[model samples]
Target: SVVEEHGQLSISNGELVNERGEQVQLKGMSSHGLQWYGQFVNYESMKWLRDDWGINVFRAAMYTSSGGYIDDPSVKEKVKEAVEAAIDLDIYVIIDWHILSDNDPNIYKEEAKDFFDEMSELYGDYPNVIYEIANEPNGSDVTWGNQIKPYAEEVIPIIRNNDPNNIIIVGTGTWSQDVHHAADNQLADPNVMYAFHFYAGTHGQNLRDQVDYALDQGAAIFVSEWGTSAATGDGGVFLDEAQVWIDFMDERNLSWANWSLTHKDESSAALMPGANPTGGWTEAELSPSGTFVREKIRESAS
Candidate 1:
């Protein structure tokens, strides 16, 4: 079992300690392969994440709806297989409930409860795992702190009752980018850490300011999703702005994971040569956007 002390998480502290105590900076990328494209659900692709890119952490997307794996029995085994692979490597994995606009927490509270409860029963003892309650909760129409809070609050205690020390990450409204708002309307549980996503150009200075304010309030922040693009459209190619934010994060000793590893649907992707959209890492046109991610990881580690 992983070590637990007080209410504050040790793994959370260990992330801080590794950054501060050992001076070992963490560099990682968030990939949607398992959930979005199903590229890295097996051992081979996972090995590539660790061996080639030196990635120590992955934000695994856990979906609750039909298209996602949680409800599908066929893909459920793949999810378990991926988690086991991650566990074997000792890489920190964030099991993010990637709830988009359509999925409602209140509607699926029972499924959410059962999903997390079973997950905790299986992997609660593992040290290198983080249970992200939900992904970005966009807009105020969806209850941010209150509706999700009951489930998060209820789910956390259940997990904590089994494993009290695992880090629980919670997101704010407006696509998890509203850290300041969440900080103002705080949850009752102190063990809860806040998460935010950044697309730099799409979010602009508003996000930076909110992050600064949240940090000032002593909020535990994690940049769970971020991406770059040269698609020349909405929220595309904020490399310069993203670099500034990355530098800011590095300076403050904050932790983050990039948006994706493979490019699909013309969204922001970090595709290397031979990255397959289907199953294998087949050949494809490597987007220039990948260079920025590659360099950022290198610079962050150095």
Candidate 2:
């Protein structure tokens, strides 16, 4: 385990660093919206991911809309399951407030406040927990200076009130691709990092340029979610471009969690539709993207 090796993670000098002041890159998987793929967030599956796949982190993508927490609120249990499993496996877990359809995080500001408030208070003490306030702040109205930064300024303090040491990953603009904007106007917190996402088939050199500029300006980043497909979660797996992206992250010391782990009929789904809900997935059960990513994770650990 990564948690034991690195202990508490933090951002220092534009890099994700561990307690020993050494750079650490966490490679792992992000769950699809818990509302749709909640069954996969079990301890057995997570254990398999850690022990076999060599994953160091797990992201609980609890979507705020699309028949998710905003509508039912019961989806929080799925996030809790992910957190518990990650802790049991001794790996890091990101509590992702996944906002896709909602676009603008301000739409659920009050609810986010309450959600994080409770989450921080309850799981703050655990070194395995990480809070991702906004999954992907998008839309023209959701600029880094205007909407995202302001929202983070308001919500981060509340989390700090309870959990002061854990790293917090903040979302960026344009589905979290606009890291340059966040770089220009970053939050005052030193432990916080910006979120950057890119689908291999869709986002290529253009997005990497943005990351380069952001890093030049001293902004820590985490690839919180990314697909091997055309950003639609389907169509094809661009392993060639994915290889480039992985190399870029490796060279830059950017930690990442692949999107995603689900049985959905999508190129990004790590498991096949017939795969077992629990752990013990065979190579035949892994999707094309899954197999490629598994090899990459194993190679990185080696």
Candidate 3:
């Protein structure tokens, strides 16, 4: 059995312990609401993660474009349902603030606060929930220790005040790839974890080296996002290098989640490119690159 105590997380042997002192292990996939066709098409994707892949974690977005925090009843309902479905499957879930272009966390601070406040209140007690402050805030200006740190310090405490000890994940600067820099700053909070996103084509030996540095520095790191594909022309795949990284992560017992659950006409997507070409709700399809990822994950787990 898992327990939640003093807002601190602890795991007993094989059980999962979340940031709130409840047993949990962060594992799963990232999926966007807009990627799907129907209003609610995440069930199948979630099933594939939980059942087929034996995954128990999910990272989902709270998109401003999708009315994630606009108080739209329908949008809220869709998001709520997806989250509930993940919970039903007994998996840990991460609510990501997918900021594509906004460098300042303050840009969406108010809405973010409201959204997280409500979400924390609703799922705060659950032993399988995490709040990812923001997605990849790219660009040279966004340094984790300098710029992002202030905002995270401000926002994380708010969540902690509300839910006490929820696992809060903060992104590194430059699309969450600068863990080396983050380790040096190392926020003084046991409840917080550092996140890094990897796209094989975009990152290679540099990523592996960074991981080594992060681990050596005693930084708690997680690969919150990654993807690969063989479709060179499509520019959506990074199959070759992803395998090497997966191997490295496995040896260290590091946890990670794939970049996506589904996408539109892209071989790099977890689902078939043209299988559900029209509808969006399609069975899990992996391009040659995806298959490589699957193999690497399997090898690592084994």
Candidate 4:
């Protein structure tokens, strides 16, 4: 297990480092919104991914809206279960405050505080815990310094109050595609890392240029979410572009979690529809994107 091998992870010189002070790149999968496809977030499935798929990290995407936490608080139970499973498997887990449809985080700032405060307190001392403050902060008016940064400034302290040692990932603007904006005005905390999301089919060299600028300007970046399809979450899987991105991330040692781990009938869903949610997936059960990502991750994991 990566966590067992690499202890607690911290940020140093714009890179993720283990307790040994060695740069570490985490490879993992993100579950579909817990409220919808939470069945895939069980212990059996996660253990299978860890053992079979060679994943060392798992992201529990607890969305805030769209019939999520704000709509129904029971989803938090799924998040807790995922965390428990990760701890048991001896792998790192990212408690993602997935904010996509919510646009601006300040709208639910208080709830964010309460949710993170509790999670941090609950998983405070565990070396496996990582907090993703916001998933993909979008919208035209939702700029980084203006909207997301202020929200992170408030919510980050809440998590720090409970767990100061773990890393906290904050989303950038424009669905986390604006890393340059974040590097211009980064948080003062050393453990903080910036989130950068992309879809290989849609984001290309233009986006890579932005990421390069962010890196050159001294921002620690994490590809918390990425897809092999288009931004809308469906379309042709762009293998060539995805390979380019994979190489880029690999060369940079950027840790990442693929967009989703669901059997949903979408281009990025790792499994075919009706595939067992509790693991034991065969080659036929794996989708095109899944096969590609799994191979890439296995290549690195070894």
**TM-scores of all candidate predictions against the true structure:** 0.84, 0.98, 0.81, 0.98
181 Cα displacement, candidate 3 (Å): 1.6
Candidate 1, residue 113: lDDT: 67
Q: Which stretches of candidate 3 lie over 4 Å from their true place?
A: 1-26, 33-41, 65-74, 230-236, 274-285, 294-302
Q: Can you list the residue pairs that collide in candidate 1? A: 33-38, 274-281, 274-282
Q: What do the candidate models score in CA lDDT, each in turn?
A: 0.65, 0.92, 0.64, 0.92
RMSD of each: 4.2, 1.0, 4.6, 0.9
Full ranking by lDDT: 4, 2, 1, 3
| lDDT score of residue 122 within candidate 3 | 88
Cα lDDT of model 2 by residue, 262-288, tens digit: 989988888899888887999999999
Q: What digit string (tens of lDDT, one per residue) describes model 1 on residues 107-180?
A: 66666667777788888887667788778776567665666666577777767776666678887777787788
Tell me the number of clashing residue pairs for each predicted model.
Answer: 3, 0, 13, 0
Pairwise lDDT winner, candidates 1 and 4: 4
**Model 4, residue 9: C-alpha shift (Å):** 0.6
lDDT digits (tens) for residues 1-302 of candidate 4:
67889999999989999999998999999999999999999999999999888999999999999999998999999999999999999999999988888889888899999999999999999999999988988899999878888899899889989999899999999989899989999899899899999998899999999999999988999999999998777667988999999999989999999978999999988889988999999999999999998898888776
